[PDB]
Scaffold this active site. Sequence first.
Site, mmCIF file in Angstrom:
data_model
loop_
_atom_site.group_PDB
_atom_site.id
_atom_site.type_symbol
_atom_site.label_atom_id
_atom_site.label_comp_id
_atom_site.label_asym_id
_atom_site.label_seq_id
_atom_site.Cartn_x
_atom_site.Cartn_y
_atom_site.Cartn_z
ATOM 1 C CD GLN A 150 -1.361 0.118 3.679
ATOM 2 O OE1 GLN A 150 -1.495 1.060 4.463
ATOM 3 N NE2 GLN A 150 -2.090 -0.984 3.761
ATOM 4 C CB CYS A 188 -4.997 -1.192 5.629
ATOM 5 S SG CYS A 188 -6.136 -0.237 6.688
ATOM 6 C CG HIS A 224 -3.458 -2.281 9.892
ATOM 7 N ND1 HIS A 224 -3.211 -1.343 8.913
ATOM 8 C CD2 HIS A 224 -2.806 -3.405 9.512
ATOM 9 C CE1 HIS A 224 -2.444 -1.879 7.980
ATOM 10 N NE2 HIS A 224 -2.184 -3.128 8.320
ATOM 11 C CG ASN A 282 -0.081 -5.895 6.928
ATOM 12 O OD1 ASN A 282 -1.031 -5.157 6.659
ATOM 13 N ND2 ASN A 282 0.943 -5.497 7.675
#
Length: 218
Positions: free
Chosen positions: A20, A26, A165, A185
Amino acid sequence: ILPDSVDWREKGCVTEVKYQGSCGACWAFSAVGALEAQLKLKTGKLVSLSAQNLVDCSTEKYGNKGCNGGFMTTAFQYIIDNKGIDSDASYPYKAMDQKCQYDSKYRAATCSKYTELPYGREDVLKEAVANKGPVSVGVDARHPSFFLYRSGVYYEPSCTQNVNHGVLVVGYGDLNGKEYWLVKNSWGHNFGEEGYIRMARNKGNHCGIASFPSYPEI
Ligand SMILES: *C(#N)C1([N]C(=O)[C]([C]S(=O)(=O)[C][C]2[C][C]C(=O)[N]2)[N][C](C2=[C][C]=C(F)[C]=[C]2)C(F)(F)F)[C][C]1
């Protein structure tokens, strides 16, 4: 009865880890990641979906702020309302806010609905990951230990259930008696275990991983 361990990467339903950059997208990566698995299960094709499409188009009307944050749930609703989301290949990620450039001629997936799991129930999350597919979740990533994580099962004494997150649970298992959630992630391959982090499971909703879980369906 649920399997003791699950890893959706073994089932070919998880795309390459994304980066990102300096853009707080996210939530967009979490949402496309969840839908990518459903698309694979429905069509047999694994295709990275456009996180940029969400950043640029699932905006104010969806309570999102592009590179400054957003909700995975409202992102799913945007895809439903919009009747589609473009492929990442046709609408590449630029790590910045742009004017919405969605075009149905580049549609790679659709969404019919999404489901939000009950708050903090890790047993329900385990069941969804095992039987439905990867689940979008939010976690408390406000501690140095998260940024400095390299391997093993992540546990932070200072973690809270205040999540900030957005990530993707693509499995679960145990490492030497230590149960964990396998999390994808969106900070690139240099983060944690080549883009992934195994977070403490069945440890009192650690870091709020089971606080706000959701998954889409096609
Ligand atoms: C990433 N990158 C960053 N976070 C977000 O966009 C988060 C994702 S989350 O998984 O924390 C969402 C959950 C839902 C309930 C909750 O409190 N967090 N979203 C944030 C956000 C949402 C909308 C907005 F306009 C700005 C931020 C959050 F956490 F406040 F909701 C770093 C961007």
